[model samples]
Target: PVPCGWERVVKQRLSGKTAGKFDVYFISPQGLKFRSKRSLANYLLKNGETFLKPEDFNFTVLP
Candidate 1:
């Protein structure tokens, strides 16, 4: 199970507008779950895009 605040953060960063409407899948030797955001973050970080902020995400909490 995911943590309480963790889900909120994840949903916020992965919400519409900022994130494109698409699905990503990855098959690993260890059978790990694929996370596109992590990939994106890594890409941006590698390119020296430090301007990216978590608050850029439109956080919308749902009941």
Candidate 2:
């Protein structure tokens, strides 16, 4: 499940070759922007007590 009060934004490529692909951004409660999966993991690692497991983040882009 997604974290509470966090924002997950899926940015789709407008005119590029990979038009259907998306850039997933996860914004934390402290207004931190996580641009990628690795970045998000680092955030959680830094403040492990603030959040839960890595799998707790479901960054799936739905249609």
Candidate 3:
């Protein structure tokens, strides 16, 4: 079975940002669900274009 609170961090991070902007979600043998902010951020940072500034993220809290 999946781990408890597996994607908690990811969810807290993306709660208001891209929560509804894109079709970010997770899928398993059980079902499909939205991806967490941390997961999404990691995905974009790793694959998507480079975000030079905080604004690039659309909802960054880093300083």
Candidate 4:
């Protein structure tokens, strides 16, 4: 059951907001905030992230 207020995550009372998008550290349950499964944080700053977008949506080869 999702809690009704902030109680840390892994497990949050409520989770529906943009990331901190900062150095603000969120208290983790197992003390593995930066070394394990993170369902909130964004991609690594060094490794970074990206998506594939190949342009033109025109499809004439099919019917």
Top lDDT hit: 2
Please list the C-alpha lDDT of all candidates, in the order they appear: 0.48, 0.82, 0.46, 0.39
> Candidate 1 regions off by >4 Å?
1-20, 37-63
How would you encode candidate 2's per-residue C-alpha lDDT over 1-63 as one tens digit per residue?
A: 677889999888878689888888888888988898887787788674664798999999999
For residues 2-61, what per-residue lDDT tens digits would candidate 3 score against the true structure?
443333222223466555444435543334343665865675475544337765666656
Q: After superposition, how far is residue 29 of candidate 3 from its true place, in Å?
A: 21
In candidate 4, residue 40 scores what lDDT?
Answer: 38
Flag the better candidate by TM-score, 3 or 4: 3
Measured with C-alpha atoms, the lDDT of residue 38 in candidate 2 is: 86
Compared to the true structure, candidate 2 yields what TM-score? 0.67
Which run of 10 residues does model 1 get worst, by summed lDDT? 3-12
Error of 4 at 29 (Å): 1.2
Tens digit per residue, CA lDDT, model 1, 1-63: 442222212233367687745554443333444467687456446542335688899789878
lDDT of 3 at 29: 31
Give residue 41's lDDT in candidate 3 (0 to 100). 61
Better-scoring candidate (TM-score), 1 or 4: 1
Question: Which residue ranges in model 4 land beyond 4 Å of their true spot?
Answer: 1-22, 34-63
**Which RMSD values do the candidates have, in order?**
16.5, 12.4, 16.1, 13.5
Estimate the TM-score of every prediction.
0.24, 0.67, 0.24, 0.19
